[PDB]
């Protein structure tokens, strides 16, 4: 265990590289990536048709990927959506350089 | 109906005989009603559905057997290779390429690949 | 592994005057035939 | 996003409501233009898709 | 502290997991616990029914020993250099019948080959005493088997092993070969490890798809069951073997992860290859020469067996608890019992009663044929707490066959009773 690897893992989780890692892990279990893309698209279409009002700020495709990751034993936030606890107040948005 | 009013669950053999009789006569809808009655009674309906489609094929009711097989495949049930071959061969001999191709697609989805026999049967109509 | 068969065939050829007439000919409720252009006027 | 008038009209409604956008099946206005032009040049063009199920030819206009 | 099958055993050494871990072997959700019988795999997390399989084990290809089945012998874990006479020994074998010889030679060379994972993994392998295979068995055990066919086959296999060792490992052989198996007992133990822990799977590496016989570490520590919870799937992109739990099955903490070897074989093949026997084997066959025939449909009805003859299971949903007499034993009975099916003709009670009484007479005859009883076998088993594993396996096989015959008798009696309702 390296002692000074807290901020790196924190930034990896916050930025969204978890999505890339999960995509690579889910493509390492598929022969043809095009059929995987079509399957994910169909599942996201079913999710959208089931609950329209649920989405709009939460992505159905990210929700499908998070469900597939959670069903594989790896804990992932629902649709990879996280909120900033250190937000100053309403109407204040962070500036990502 | 008397046995059911008696409060006793009917045996699987009774429902099998009823399904066979309905398939021999050609009453596919009553056969499906019996299958649903077996399903709500927690009985397994795979063997009864196979006997039903086989009797419907034998009773010359090809389209009824085809739609019953399609309903069973949509339900999630599986079929034996002999049922696949019989359905495909009869549909190709009659001239119905659409149902034959649909049954072939359902078979390949179920895990069983197609051999030269099914392709020759399909080409018999395609030519 | 039966493939998903998609069959689309575009076709081109010389058209008879009957077809180029039927592309324009229409029968109004009164019974006249419209489609013929006979005057150079545009507007 | 370019030429399909109906689809484009439906895109705004589907996005505002939130429903899934269906895949367009009709030919774009560019193809229809070509057909009209070529038929002004006395040349025909028909889509003529054939169903693999029942071996029937269906013209797309 | 809830009582669980894992709790009764003790946890294994940390090192056993560690040697694999530093080499990329990964385990998710499972624990390795050692016991008197040997190592086993147990769950450490509650898994609800899943839509798709979950990977508990990821085993890389660089820790495995793999030999192709067909004539071109391709070692994808290529630890054998070119020109080595061990390949001359391996190739001088019949391609179809004898495959354990090549695996044994490969395992011996891997034990000899430096910086190999199997050099460290062999310490955890069962020793000659711990091994339960009948190749490492005395004539007393084969005589106690009370089965002439199985004893003869095992003696013939031992003779084949000895003859192969005496032919290939002669005095004029080079020292690099001689150091592999200096004594024939080492070669017999290698053949035992190869036979008892072989996996036959189809693997794809690069562009080549082939079928091969592989010795995979950490996947042979899973016990056998006829209702498996996991299966051996292959991943070609990462070139790893993955063990995945069956989809739609609920696994609770403390359960034992199990896989199926030889799905559809009798206890004879199990006792021959793995030195194991199960009383609930659903594929056991009992040869009955009686002219009597029971009714198959009424039997499956009274015993609540549903499905095609190729797939039999107890519908416990219709069972409503209660009947637990139903198990793989009655399924194997219904499979082996002589049965008659003639359309929808209803069975006759008198004919079926005569049939079941004739079957009970024949079963009592077959039970009297063995010069022992279930109580005597159980007493001999409990009388010897520590003894040879082969003798224990033999007496367990005898007890399992006797219990199977007794349960067949009891099932016929229950059928005769319940048919008249």
UniProtKB/TrEMBL annotation, chain A:
GO cellular component, one term: plastid-encoded plastid RNA polymerase complex
BP-aspect Gene Ontology terms: plastid transcription
Protein name, UniProt field: Protein PLASTID TRANSCRIPTIONALLY ACTIVE 7
Naturally occurring in which organism (per UniProt): Nicotiana tabacum (Common tobacco)
Gene name of the encoded protein: LOC107767271
Residues of the full protein shown: 70 to 166 of 167
UniProtKB/TrEMBL annotation, chain C:
Function: DNA-dependent RNA polymerase catalyzes the transcription of DNA into RNA using the four ribonucleoside triphosphates as substrates.
Family, as annotated: Belongs to the RNA polymerase beta' chain family. RpoC1 subfamily.
Protein name: DNA-directed RNA polymerase subunit gamma
Taxonomy of the source species: Eukaryota, Viridiplantae, Streptophyta, Embryophyta, Tracheophyta
From TrEMBL, chain E:
GO biological process: methylation
Domain (SET) ranges: 17-262
Molecular function GO labels: methyltransferase activity
Source species, domain of life: Eukaryota
UniProt keyword list: Methyltransferase, S-adenosyl-L-methionine, Transferase
Keyword Ligase recorded: no
Protein name: Protein PLASTID TRANSCRIPTIONALLY ACTIVE 14-like isoform X2
Gene (UniProt): LOC107826747
Residues of the full protein shown: 87 to 507 of 507
């Amino acid at each position: 265990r390296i002692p000074f690897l807290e901020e790196q893992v924190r930034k990896i989780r916050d930025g969204g590289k978890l999505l890339t890692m999960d995509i690579h892990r889910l493509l390492l279990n598929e022969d043809n990536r095009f059929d995987f893309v079509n399957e994910i698209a169909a599942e996201a279409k079913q999710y959208v048709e089931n609950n329209r009002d649920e989405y709009g700020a939460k992505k159905a495709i990210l929700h499908v990927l998070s469900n597939r990751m959670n069903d594989a034993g790896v804990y992932r936030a629902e649709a990879y959506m996280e909120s900033d606890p250190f937000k100053p107040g309403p109407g204040y948005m962070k500036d990502e350089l | 109906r008397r046995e059911l009013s008696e409060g006793l669950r009917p045996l699987h053999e009774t429902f099998l005989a009823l399904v066979r009789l309905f398939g021999a006569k050609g009453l596919a809808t009553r056969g499906l009603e019996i299958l649903a009655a077996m399903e709500k009674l927690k009985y397994d309906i795979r063997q009864a559905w196979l006997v039903l489609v086989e009797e419907l094929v034998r009773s010359n009711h090809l389209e009824d057997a085809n739609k019953v097989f399609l309903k069973g495949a949509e339900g999630g049930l599986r079929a034996t290779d002999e049922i696949y071959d019989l359905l495909i061969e009869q549909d190709c001999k009659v001239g119905d390429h659409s149902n034959a191709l649909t049954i072939a697609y359902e078979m390949e989805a179920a895990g069983r690949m197609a051999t030269t026999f099914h392709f020759n049967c399909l080409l018999s109509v395609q030519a | 592994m039966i493939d998903r068969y998609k069959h689309q065939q575009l076709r081109i050829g010389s058209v008879s005057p009957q077809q180029i007439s039927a592309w324009a000919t229409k029968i109004l409720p009164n019974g006249e035939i419209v489609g013929e252009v006979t005057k150079p006027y545009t507007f | 996003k370019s030429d399909h008038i109906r689809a484009r009209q439906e895109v705004l409604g589907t996005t505002i409501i939130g429903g899934t956008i269906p895949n367009p099946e009709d030919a774009p206005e560019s193809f229809r233009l070509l057909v009209r032009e070529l038929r002004s040049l006395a040349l025909e063009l028909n889509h003529f898709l054939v169903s693999e199920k029942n071996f029937q030819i269906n013209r797309k206009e | 502290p809830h009582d669980t099958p894992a709790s009764q055993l003790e946890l294994a050494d940390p090192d056993f997991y560690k040697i694999g871990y530093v080499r990329s072997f990964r385990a998710y959700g499972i624990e390795f616990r050692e016991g008197p019988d040997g190592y086993g795999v147990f769950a450490s997390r509650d898994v609800e029914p899943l839509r798709r399989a979950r990977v508990i084990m990821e085993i890389p290809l660089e820790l495995m020993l793999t030999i192709s089945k067909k004539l071109p012998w391709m070692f994808f874990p290529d630890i054998i250099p070119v020109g080595h006479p061990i390949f001359d020994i391996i190739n001088s074998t019949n391609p179809e019948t004898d495959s354990d010889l090549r695996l044994a030679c490969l395992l011996l060379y891997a034990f000899d080959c430096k910086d190999n994972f199997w050099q460290l993994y062999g310490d955890f392998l069962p020793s000659d005493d711990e091994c339960t295979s009948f190749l490492l068995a005395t004539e007393e055990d084969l005589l106690e088997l009370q089965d002439e066919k199985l004893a003869s086959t095992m003696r013939e296999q031992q003779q084949r092993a000895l003859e192969f060792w005496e032919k290939n490992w002669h005095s004029a052989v080079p020292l690099k070969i001689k150091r592999l198996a200096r004594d024939p007992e080492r070669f017999i133990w290698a053949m035992c490890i190869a036979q008892s822990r072989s996996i036959n799977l189809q693997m794809r590496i690069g562009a080549l798809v082939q079928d091969a016989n592989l010795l995979v570490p950490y996947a042979d520590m899973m016990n056998h069951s006829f209702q498996p919870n996991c299966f051996f799937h292959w991943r070609f992109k990462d070139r790893m073997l993955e063990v995945m739990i069956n989809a739609g099955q609920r696994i609770r903490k403390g359960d034992e992860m199990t896989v199926d070897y030889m799905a559809g074989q009798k206890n004879n093949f199990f006792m021959q290859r793995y030195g194991f026997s199960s009383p609930v084997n659903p594929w056991d066959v009992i040869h009955f020469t009686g002219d009597a025939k029971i009714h198959l449909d009424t039997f499956l009805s009274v015993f609540n067996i549903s499905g095609l003859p190729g797939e039999y299971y107890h519908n416990s949903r219709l069972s409503n608890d209660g009947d637990s007499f139903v198990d793989g034993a009655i399924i194997a009975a219904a499979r082996t019992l002589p049965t008659w099916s003639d359309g929808d003709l209803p069975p006759i009670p008198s004919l079926e009663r005569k049939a079941v009484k004739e079957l009970q007479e024949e079963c009592h005859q077959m039970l009297a044929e063995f010069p022992t009883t279930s109580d005597e076998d159980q007493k001999i088993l409990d009388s010897m707490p520590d003894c040879r594993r082969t003798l224990e396996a033999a007496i367990k096989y005898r007890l399992h066959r006797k219990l199977l015959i007794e349960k067949v008798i009891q099932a016929l009696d229950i059928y005769q009773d319940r048919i008249l309702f």
